[PDB]
Amino acid sequence: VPSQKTYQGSYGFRLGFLHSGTAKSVTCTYSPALNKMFCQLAKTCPVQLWVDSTPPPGTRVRAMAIYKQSQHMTEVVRRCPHHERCSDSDGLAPPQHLIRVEGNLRVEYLDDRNTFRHSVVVPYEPPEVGSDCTTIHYNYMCNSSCMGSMNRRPILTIITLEDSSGNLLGRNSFEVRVCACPGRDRRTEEENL
Ligand SMILES: [As]
Ligand SMILES: [Zn+2]
């Protein structure tokens, strides 16, 4: 099982999220209290990389999903057969991969040879000039309620900062729910606090 231990590392690596709120029109919204992202299928999911100092050239940013619950954690998170077989290809992403990056022609996808786990990696870019963070647009290509894969089992996304040689520079994570009404579902999951 890949580590999910938070690790700010040498560069002070942390995640940020847009403050999108829970209006019914929201397609992507993050709950600080639950550290949980609520997303519509295949919609832009902005994840902000915040660093205290700029990591070197060739730094890369990896995303990987694992099941949150210990009893499922060894199971590879992958798209259900239906979504696997859907005609929603962007021509870069493997059809089985739950997490894609959109709007980045330098995206790289990995099926780990030994663990079989899926990940998607992009070059780290410094914040645009005048910005304080780097935003990656992720897409989640299968629903939490999909019976053929996650089937209501919660998943985590682990975001890793690695150098060009693959050494770990930093790590963070957040829970993800892929659903029809993220605004409503966030608001609802938060009313039980
Ligand atoms: As999202
Ligand atoms: Zn699915």
Domain ranges of the chain: 1-193
**Residue 80 annotated as part of some ligand binding site:** yes
- Look-up of token digits 């709007």: 103
Phi and psi, residue 49, nearest 5°: -95, 120
Residues 176/155, Cβ–Cβ less than 8 Å: yes
Task: Tell me how the structure was determined.
Answer: X-ray
State if residue 39 touches ligand 1 by the CB under 6 angstroms criterion: yes
Distance CA 53, CA 33 (A): 27
The ligand with the least distance to the CA atom of 45 is: 1
Distance, CA 19 to ligand 2 centroid (Å)?
27
Ligand number, closest to the Cα atom of 96? 2
Nearest CA-CA partner of 138 in 55, 52, 56, 37? 37
- How many CB atoms within 10 Å of residue 40? 20
Q: Is 176 in the pocket of ligand 1 (CB under 6 A)?
A: no
Separation of CA 40 and ligand 1 centre (Å): 7
- What are the backbone dihedrals phi and psi of residue 189, each rounded to the nearest 5 degrees, phi first? -65, -25
Query: What would the two tokens of residue 114 be?
Result: 């030994």
Answer yes or no: is the C-beta of 28 below 6 A from any ligand 1 atom: yes
Which residue, among 179, 191, 193, has the nearest Cα to 24 in the 3D structure?
179
DSSP of the chain = ------B-TTTT-EEE-------TT-SEEEETTTTEEEE-TT--EEEEEE-SSPPPTT-EEEEEEEESSGGGTTSPP---HHHHHSS---SSS-TT-SEEE-S-TT-EEEE-TTT--EEEEEE--PPPTT-SSEEEEEEE-S-TT-TTTTTT--EEEEEEEE-TT--EEEEEEEEEEE-S-HHHHHHHHHHT-
Residues in CB range of 7: below 8 A, 6 or more apart = 13, 168, 170, 171, 172
Relative to beta strand 134-140, strand 118-123 is unpaired
- Ligand sitting nearest the alpha carbon of 80: 2
The rounded Å distance from CA 74 to ligand 1 centre is 24
Provide the token pair at 37.
């992202």
Is residue 19 a known part of a binding site? no
